[PDB]
Design an enzyme around this catalytic site. Structure first.
Site, short mmCIF file in Angstrom:
data_model
loop_
_atom_site.label_atom_id
_atom_site.label_comp_id
_atom_site.label_asym_id
_atom_site.label_seq_id
_atom_site.Cartn_x
_atom_site.Cartn_y
_atom_site.Cartn_z
N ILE A 175 0.95 -1.26 -0.02
CA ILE A 175 0.27 0.01 0.02
C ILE A 175 0.89 1.37 0.03
O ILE A 175 0.38 2.44 -0.12
CB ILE A 175 -0.85 -0.09 1.25
CG1 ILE A 175 -0.45 -0.18 2.46
CG2 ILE A 175 -2.05 -0.98 0.86
CD1 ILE A 175 -1.39 0.33 3.71
N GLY B 183 8.58 4.15 0.31
CA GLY B 183 9.40 5.24 0.77
C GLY B 183 10.42 5.19 0.96
O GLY B 183 11.16 4.03 0.72
N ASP C 15 7.09 15.81 11.50
CA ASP C 15 6.65 15.62 10.13
C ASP C 15 4.99 15.64 10.08
O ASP C 15 4.46 14.76 9.34
CB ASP C 15 7.15 14.52 9.29
CG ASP C 15 7.26 14.42 7.79
OD1 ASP C 15 6.97 15.56 7.15
OD2 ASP C 15 6.91 13.23 7.33
O1 LIG Z 1 1.31 3.91 9.38
C1 LIG Z 1 0.98 3.92 8.29
N1 LIG Z 1 1.48 4.38 7.24
C2 LIG Z 1 2.72 4.86 6.97
C3 LIG Z 1 3.62 5.03 8.04
N2 LIG Z 1 5.01 5.43 7.74
C4 LIG Z 1 5.20 5.87 6.49
C5 LIG Z 1 4.42 5.70 5.35
C6 LIG Z 1 4.71 6.13 4.08
C7 LIG Z 1 5.40 7.02 3.86
C8 LIG Z 1 5.96 7.44 2.46
C9 LIG Z 1 5.47 6.85 1.38
C10 LIG Z 1 4.55 5.62 1.78
C11 LIG Z 1 4.23 5.50 3.10
C12 LIG Z 1 3.04 5.15 5.72
C13 LIG Z 1 -0.46 3.45 8.50
C14 LIG Z 1 -1.10 2.96 9.50
C15 LIG Z 1 -2.39 2.51 9.51
N3 LIG Z 1 -3.28 2.64 8.39
C16 LIG Z 1 -2.79 3.58 7.68
N4 LIG Z 1 -3.77 3.61 6.37
C17 LIG Z 1 -3.50 3.97 5.23
O2 LIG Z 1 -2.67 4.06 4.65
C18 LIG Z 1 -4.86 4.09 4.53
C19 LIG Z 1 -4.78 4.05 2.79
C20 LIG Z 1 -5.14 5.25 3.56
C21 LIG Z 1 -1.45 3.88 7.51
#
Ligand SMILES: O=C(Nc1cncc(-c2ccccc2)c1)c1ccnc(NC(=O)C2CC2)c1
Length: 338
Positions: free
Chosen positions: A27, A30, A141
């Site tokens: 999902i 990064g 952030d």
């Molecule tokens: O910690 C969570 N996501 C996260 C943490 N740290 C970094 C990233 C990151 C940064 C850069 C690029 C890509 C991803 C994402 C996290 C927890 C629980 N639920 C979700 N939910 C979603 O992502 C729903 C679909 C919207 C998300």
């Protein structure tokens, strides 16, 4: 199919358990690594699994911070486990939306997010900040993408503690944290002696963005971002510059009421001006922001969500959370709060 691991619960004593999950899909990708979504076999609950490479020389700072946090407005670390060089996997409760995705839907439909959701989301963000700041922890952030939302319950959870860290007075910290549009001016000037008030500036940028339907201080470079800040706040004084960290364009302060649309509530504008201040110490603390009059509607016992349901938990403050200013419990916890 089904993946079975031995994972340690996020909270409580270190006693690993066998945990099985399925429907694993990527999902997010990064600089840190990858984030997957999966379904726990025992309960059917959805989780996000953030997979990062383990340093080997030291304990992972994000994990150490996550193991200390327990708050309704912070994403829950359910488990953590190591896997194949070693990788750390943080298993978090999945939340389906983000403020970034919701604000983009309204912006594309040429509509603004109703003020009731602006109040609910900003208040819950300020509560999460009050909680982490009570431990000396700065997120570093704060931005719409890191504000998770459940659209049915209107619950907001702060996520991504990859940049978070405890700020100790006298210790220098890297200035190159925080994302474009949301960086406090002291970070743009390269200050290494900043405080947790950088998170409050970032929260103010999120509030202004939800009111405007677009970022308040855009720009792909710090010069452009700083010119946008100066267009709204006016040129900073020599004292304000010293409090943050050259010949700046002599621009007068634009009246805050003219920054937003005419229908914008004046309490929302008043709250913005007290968060988006040049002097870091002049900004409201997160707890003072929660007590601001813009959030008085949330403390009314008759308020309900537009979908008919009751508002989420908003007044279950702990001693830890109120520690920066205990007398605010009189405003923050209303008579009807159970
Ligand atoms: O910690 C969570 N996501 C996260 C943490 N740290 C970094 C990233 C990151 C940064 C850069 C690029 C890509 C991803 C994402 C996290 C927890 C629980 N639920 C979700 N939910 C979603 O992502 C729903 C679909 C919207 C998300």
């Amino acid at each position: 199919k089904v993946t079975t691991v031995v994972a340690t619960p996020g909270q409580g004593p270190d006693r690993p358990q066998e945990v099985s999950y399925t429907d694993t899909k990527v999902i997010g990708n990064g600089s840190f690594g990858v984030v997957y979504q999966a379904k726990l076999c025992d309960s059917g609950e959805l989780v996000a699994i953030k997979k990062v490479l383990q340093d080997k020389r030291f304990k992972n700072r994000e994990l150490q911070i996550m193991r200390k946090l327990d708050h309704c407005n912070i994403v829950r670390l359910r488990y953590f486990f190591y896997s194949s060089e070693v990788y750390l996997n943080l298993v978090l409760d999945y939340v389906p939306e983000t403020v970034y995705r919701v604000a983009r839907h309204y912006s594309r439909a040429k509509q603004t997010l109703p003020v009731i959701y602006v109040k609910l989301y900003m208040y819950q963000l300020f509560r999460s900040l009050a909680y982490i700041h009570s431990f000396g922890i700065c997120h570093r952030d704060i931005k719409p993408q890191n504000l998770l939302l459940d659209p049915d319950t209107a619950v907001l959870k702060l996520c991504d503690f990859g940049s978070a860290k405890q700020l100790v007075r006298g210790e220098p910290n890297v200035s190159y944290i925080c994302s474009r549009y949301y960086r406090a001016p002291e970070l743009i000037f390269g200050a290494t002696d900043y405080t947790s008030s950088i998170d409050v500036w970032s929260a103010g940028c999120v509030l202004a963005e939800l009111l405007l339907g677009q970022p308040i201080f855009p720009g792909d470079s710090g010069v452009d971002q700083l010119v946008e800040i100066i267009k709204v706040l006016g040129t900073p004084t020599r004292e304000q510059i010293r409090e943050m960290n050259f010949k700046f364009p002599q621009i007068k302060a634009h009246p805050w009421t003219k920054v937003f649309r005419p229908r914008t509530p004046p309490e929302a504008i008043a709250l913005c001006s007290r968060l988006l201040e040049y002097t870091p110490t002049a900004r409201l603390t997160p707890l003072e922001a929660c007590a601001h009059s813009f959030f008085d509607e949330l403390r009314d016992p008759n308020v309900k969500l537009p979908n008919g349901r009751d508002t989420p938990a908003l007044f279950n403050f702990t001693t830890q959370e109120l520690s920066s200013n205990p007398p605010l419990a009189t405003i923050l916890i209303p008579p009807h709060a159970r």
